[PDB]
RNA sequence: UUUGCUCCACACAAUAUAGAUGGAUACGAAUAAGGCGUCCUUGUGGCGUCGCUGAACCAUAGCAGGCUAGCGAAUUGCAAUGUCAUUUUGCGUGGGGAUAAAUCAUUUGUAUACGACUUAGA
RNA sequence: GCCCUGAAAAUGGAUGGCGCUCAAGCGUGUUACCUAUACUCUACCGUCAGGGUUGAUAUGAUGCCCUGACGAGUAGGCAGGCGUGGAGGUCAGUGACGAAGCCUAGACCGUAAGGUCGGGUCGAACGGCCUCUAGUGCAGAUCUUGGUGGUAGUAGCAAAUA
RNA sequence: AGAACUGGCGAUGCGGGAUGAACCGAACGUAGAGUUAAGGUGCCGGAAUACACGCUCAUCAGACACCACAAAAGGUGUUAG
RNA sequence: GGAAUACUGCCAGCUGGGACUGAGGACUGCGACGUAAGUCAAGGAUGCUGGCAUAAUGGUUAUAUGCCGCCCGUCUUGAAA
RNA sequence: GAAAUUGUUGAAAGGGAAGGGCAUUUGAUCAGACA
């Protein structure tokens, strides 16, 4: 489907570049003389609910599937009914002898694996 | 595509030349009837310096 | 012959703007020889091209083209607006674009 | 305000049972449309008679064109107006071809020379002058002599393109 | 904006379901939302709204 | 539609020529203003001299080399007028002044080229007759410009060469117009003159 | 110690566009005045003509632009730069060409905080 | 009426600047044009209100779909959520074939809090989900402790005879 | 300094008044198109070096209400009664 | 005396150019056209053709350019102070 | 074996600050349903 991402940027914190102690995780400026809370012109844009995504194309990858997280061969079997719908992303700690199993089971069942080139060797 | 086939395009199909000939030989008994027309079709069109395409009549 | 041109070389004036604010989606194109809004109604829909030269070669060409069309007339002097596909880069304020005659109604 | 149109307005106090035939009042009013003309009626009438818009009605409003709008006429205008300090009465003269063109020329001539707006001008009487001895203002008398030929010395050519390739000549 | 007559986005102050987590009461609301919506009788709207009522508003008879 | 445009700035009003140049040089047009010593400016003489001696007072107090520089040449008085009408503190405005050259007199690169004249900024079309105006050469040499006599000398050394050129070209068109009249009674001239030609 | 360098000739690669695609086509002065023509005793002169826009003038007929000494022009499929001009800088090819200085260190004191300055030394 | 005189202040300066004089000034009039997060139409998100829906496999009703309106906000109130240290339960979860950590102008998801993945490093434990519990979320407090800078190769290291 | 009535700022961004807590316009989910408000259209600056009738020459002219000032008194300056 | 033309208003008069949008996803409704078969611009886009499937076109990121952008916390009627 | 802070190498920018917002050019880089 044609997806439309509203506001593809990141919503960094105000002054998150100026100082190293503040991070780029977003925090609402609860100041009284703030020029970000007051929504001045030329300052950054805050999260509002208007920037939400379409309810048909929310949580969809650019490929067009919802990403799942598998951890074993049993966690693949919740996806063989929904192959167009769900992709499969092997978790970040599945060992290399266990990746070539479920990368090979998903080649049989036909699930579109998201990160197959991880820990390949 | 990695063949470079040239699927019968360098030379010509036989019957295609006659239909272009019949149309040409039927039209030139009208083009040469008026003066300076065969010289007018043989020269391309371009814009000069004062060519304003909203004012001049085509 | 050295007669080759089928466009009219307009300039790229600015973005559509107010005082102190500008909107980079709409650019103002000053076509040559156009002095009124009526007879700027001839060029509506005819498409422009901003041809420029780059250094790295793509598709075997060193010249890259940005297309786009003429949308509506601007005020009282034959300025027109234009909506390019990718907007013009604002280094081209006072840079020749070429209004073609491609969707023609003559 | 705008391009003037002379109206006439007939008005009337609303009748009652004691007097179900009140007298009609006529004004010749230069205004810009039918709505401003009906407001200028109840302005000059209410400064003359015990009647408001609420107490009276308007009998008829018509437009008055001219019988000869292709003949010059030495108009003679009586006008009162409020200055910045006091009120005055005046008498100017206009030359223009149409009666409503003289009132347009009058309001421009008063807003320039005395800074008197539309809201501070009451016209009194606009009358064509029939013979050439009643004209008594010098700036009209020069256009009333025999063999009126004058030249136009300094002609300017309004340009369309922004550059020219010869020094322009103002000769006529 | 509009010149707002009365307050915007105000919840109507009536509950639409019980505060409780009683499963054996949630099935009684699954019975009486069917009845009160598919029967024109006004008794069922009364017992529907009365099953939401808190213990203070539901005194012993 | 000329790439280089040479403007004959004799009898042009200063601020009206400087406003149809700032708008033109911001649209990408290399404009060369020429003989700016004959520019005009409205108002009488000492009124404009007093509007310049008010400008000469305005300098930085603590170091007078910091403040406004009072350029005195007539090319630089017009360049002061143009630079006000361009946003010259940016990269658009700085590039729009790299397309402008102004001289007083006509230099040897520009004496053989055509000179055009802006009609909406001439004195003899805008100023009502009887008004007192001011030539920018006489004003600028009264506030400290030293080369007015040089520019008047070099201009007379080139007016006698351009008059020499015109007499050669006038005798050219004399023997062409006296020759083309025999080529007028043809049939193609009878064929072309009905075409507006 | 023909490796250096200078310049002129294509074979290049290459980088960079404040933005080439018919022609920047030349009297001066005056504007309550001039241009051009035309004779005349040569003038601050007679006579004719012109302006009211350069929308002019000059160029422009072919494969992105031919020829045998009248023929070549197709299928680049219905549009997609459909190119091509410059400013530079290195490298080959051969045609010539010229055969130095400055700084530091040492010195001087007309100079001097240090730099700088001014001097002298095969 | 306009203009001028009356009308004098301290750094150099202000119709915003340039500049303008049949205005690019003033008075008045007629049109055309430019443009705000306003108005109109459309999309999408959310919130609120009103409806439809136990036909029937998401059996299902925390939903499902239909309709319309609305959206600023400090102090403040309530709601839905993310994150953390430990606890009961479950995934017969992950792991020396590399757990946790840390780095990464590499990728993806979410309006956001944050979640997931690739690479590098590294070496022994750690997560998801349903619930329980609190010594649970930092930019400030002339905050506390520890660490490090610019200043800075700077001030200077010159009394007591050598 | 002090009260009465409303409106606003506080608590509020936006377009305009160059600039500004309060004035004019208008109050805000995220975008696209269209049309305007207040103010503007020589150039900086998007938009008429438009049109129409006048007035005005200042050796400190004058130009966007709040608003960043000016008076009595004058003048055969000019224009009009 | 007879017209005509302005100006204002009306048309469920005809007609041309351009821009932005294509939400929804079996049918049902309304209404035209039709003798009928059905067809339709009538409860939201399709038809045809071409190019590309490699870096076309998108994402991030650095810089350039146009326009805007004062330093946060804080007490305060009012803080960039 | 994190950050402050520092060194070498690589990229880029730089006329009296730096940083940020919307938009695109240019370079770098990443990409997948049809692949």
Task: Show the helix and strand layout.
The structure is cut from a larger assembly and holds chains A (121 residues), B (58 residues), C (106 residues), D (172 residues), E (61 residues) and F (197 residues).
Chain B: H1 16-31, H2 37-41
Chain E: H1 23-37, H2 43-50
Chain F: E1 4-8, H1 14-17, H2 19-25, E2 30-34, E3 40-42, H3 45-53, H4 74-84, H5 91-96, E4 100-102, H6 123-126, E5 133-135, H7 136-140, H8 148-180, H9 188-192
Parallel strand pairs in F: 1-2, 2-4
Antiparallel strand pairs in F: 3-5
Chain F binds five RNA strands through strand 1, helix 1, helix 2, helix 3 and helix 4.
Subcellular location (chain D): Cytoplasm
Keywords (chain D): Cytoplasm, Isopeptide bond, Phosphoprotein, Ribonucleoprotein, Ribosomal protein, Ubl conjugation
Protein name (chain D): Large ribosomal subunit protein eL20A
Q: Level of helix content of chain F?
A: 40-55%
Binned, the helix content of chain B reads 25-40%
What proportion strand of chain B? under 5%
Give the helices and strands of chain F as they follow along the chain: EHHEEHHHEHEHHH
Shape of chain F: elongated
CA-based gyration radius of chain B: 19 Å
Largest sheet of chain F: 3 strands, parallel
Task: Count every helix of chain B, treating DSSP H or I runs of 4 or more residues as helices.
Answer: 2
Major sheet summary line of chain B: none
Greatest interface:
B-C, 13 and 15 residues
Number of strands of chain B: 0
How many beta-strand runs of chain F?
5
Describe the structure concisely.
Chain A: InterPro entries: Ribosomal_eL32, Ribosomal_eL32_CS, Ribosomal_eL32_sf. With 121 residues, chain A is low in regular secondary structure. Chain A has one helix and two strands; from the N terminus they run ββα.
Report on this model:
This is part of a larger assembly, with chains A (121 residues), B (58 residues), C (106 residues), D (172 residues), E (61 residues) and F (197 residues). Chain B starts with 15 loop residues before the first helix and ends in a 17-residue tail after the last helix. Chain B is an all-alpha fold. Chain B has 2 helices and no strands. Chain D has 2 domains: 3-69, Roll (Ubiquitin-like (UB roll)); 70-146, Ubiquitin-like (UB roll) (Roll), CATH 3.10.20. The longest helix of chain D is centred in the middle third of the chain and has 15 residues, at 99-113. In chain E, helix 1 runs antiparallel to helix 2. Chains in contact: B-C, C-F, D-F. Chain C binds chain F through residues 11, 13, 30, 32, 93-96, and chain F through 1, 26-28, 92, 96. Chain F binds 5 RNA strands through strand 1, helix 1, helix 2, helix 3 and helix 4. Chain E: This is Large ribosomal subunit protein eL18A.
């Amino acid at each position: 489907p044609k997806i439309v991402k509203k506001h593809t940027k990141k919503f960094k914190r105000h002054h998150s570049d100026r100082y190293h102690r503040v991070a780029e995780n977003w925090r609402k400026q609860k100041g009284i003389d703030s020029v970000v809370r007051r929504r001045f012109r030329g300052n950054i844009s805050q999260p509002k609910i208007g920037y939400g995504s379409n309810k048909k194309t929310k949580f969809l990858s650019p490929s067009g599937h919802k990403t799942f997280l598998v951890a074993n061969v049993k966690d693949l079997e919740t996806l063989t009914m929904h192959t167009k719908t769900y992709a499969a992303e092997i978790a970040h700690n599945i060992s290399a002898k266990n990746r070539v199993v479920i990368l090979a089971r998903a080649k049989a069942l036909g699930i579109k694996v998201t990160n197959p080139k991880g820990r390949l060797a | 595509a990695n063949l470079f086939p040239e699927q019968q395009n360098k030379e010509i199909k036989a019957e295609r030349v006659e239909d272009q000939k019949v149309v040409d030989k039927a039209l030139i008994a009208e083009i040469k009837k008026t003066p300076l027309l065969k010289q007018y079709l043989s020269a391309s069109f371009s814009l000069k310096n004062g060519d304003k395409p909203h004012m001049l009549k085509f | 012959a050295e007669s080759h041109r089928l466009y009219v070389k307009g300039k790229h004036l600015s973005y559509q703007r107010s005082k102190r604010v500008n909107n980079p989606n709409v650019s103002l194109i000053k076509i040559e020889g156009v002095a009124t809004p009526q007879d700027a109604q001839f060029y509506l829909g005819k498409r422009i091209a901003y041809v420029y030269r780059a250094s790295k070669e793509v598709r075997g060409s060193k010249i890259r083209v940005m297309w786009g069309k003429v949308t509506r007339t601007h005020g009282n002097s034959g300025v027109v607006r234009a909506t390019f596909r990718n907007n013009l880069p604002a280094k081209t304020f006072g840079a020749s674009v070429r209004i073609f005659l491609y969707p023609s109604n003559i | 305000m705008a391009h003037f149109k002379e109206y006439q307005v007939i008005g009337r106090r609303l009748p009652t049972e004691s007097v179900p035939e009140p007298k009609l009042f006529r004004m010749r009013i230069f205004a810009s449309n039918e709505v401003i003309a009906k407001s200028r009626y109840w302005y000059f009438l209410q400064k003359l008679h015990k009647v408001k818009k609420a107490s009276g009605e308007i009998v008829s409003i018509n437009q008055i064109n001219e019988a000869h709008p292709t003949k010059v006429k030495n108009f003679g205008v009586w006008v009162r107006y409020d200055s910045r300090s006091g009120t005055h009465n005046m008498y100017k003269e206009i030359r223009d071809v149409s009666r409503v063109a003289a009132v347009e020329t009058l309001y421009q001539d008063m807003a320039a020379r005395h800074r008197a707006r539309f809201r501070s001008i009451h016209i009194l009487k606009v009358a064509e002058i029939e013979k050439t001895a009643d004209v008594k203002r010098q700036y009209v008398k020069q256009f009333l002599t025999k063999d009126l030929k004058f030249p136009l010395p300094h002609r300017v050519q309004k340009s369309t393109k922004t550059f020219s390739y010869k020094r322009p000549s103002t000769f006529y | 904006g509009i010149d707002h007559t009365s307050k915007q986005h105000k919840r109507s102050g009536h509950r639409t379901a019980p505060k409780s987590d009683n499963v054996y009461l949630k099935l009684l609301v699954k019975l009486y939302t069917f009845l009160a919506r598919r029967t024109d009788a006004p008794f069922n709207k009364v017992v529907l709204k009365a099953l939401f009522l808190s213990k203070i508003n539901r005194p012993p008879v | 539609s000329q790439p280089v445009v040479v403007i004959d700035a004799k009898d042009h009003l200063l601020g009206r020529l400087a406003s149809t140049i700032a708008k033109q040089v911001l649209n990408g047009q290399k404009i060369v203003v020429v003989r700016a010593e004959a520019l005009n400016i409205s108002g009488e003489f000492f009124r404009n001299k007093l509007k310049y001696h008010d400008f000469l007072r305005k300098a930085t107090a603590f170091n007078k080399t910091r403040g406004p520089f009072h350029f005195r040449a007539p090319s630089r008085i017009l360049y002061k007028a143009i630079r006000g009408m361009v946003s010259h503190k940016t990269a658009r405005g700085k590039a729009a002044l790299e397309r402008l050259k102004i001289f007083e007199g006509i230099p040897p690169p520009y004496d053989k080229k055509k000179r055009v004249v802006v009609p909406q900024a001439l004195r003899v079309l805008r100023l009502k007759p009887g008004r007192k105006y001011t030539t920018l050469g006489k004003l600028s040499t009264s506030v400290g410009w030293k080369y007015e006599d040089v520019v008047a000398k070099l201009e007379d050394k080139r007016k006698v060469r351009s008059a020499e050129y015109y007499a050669k070209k006038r005798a050219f068109t004399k023997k062409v117009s006296s020759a083309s009249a025999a080529a007028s009674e043809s049939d193609v001239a009878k064929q072309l003159a009905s075409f507006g030609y």
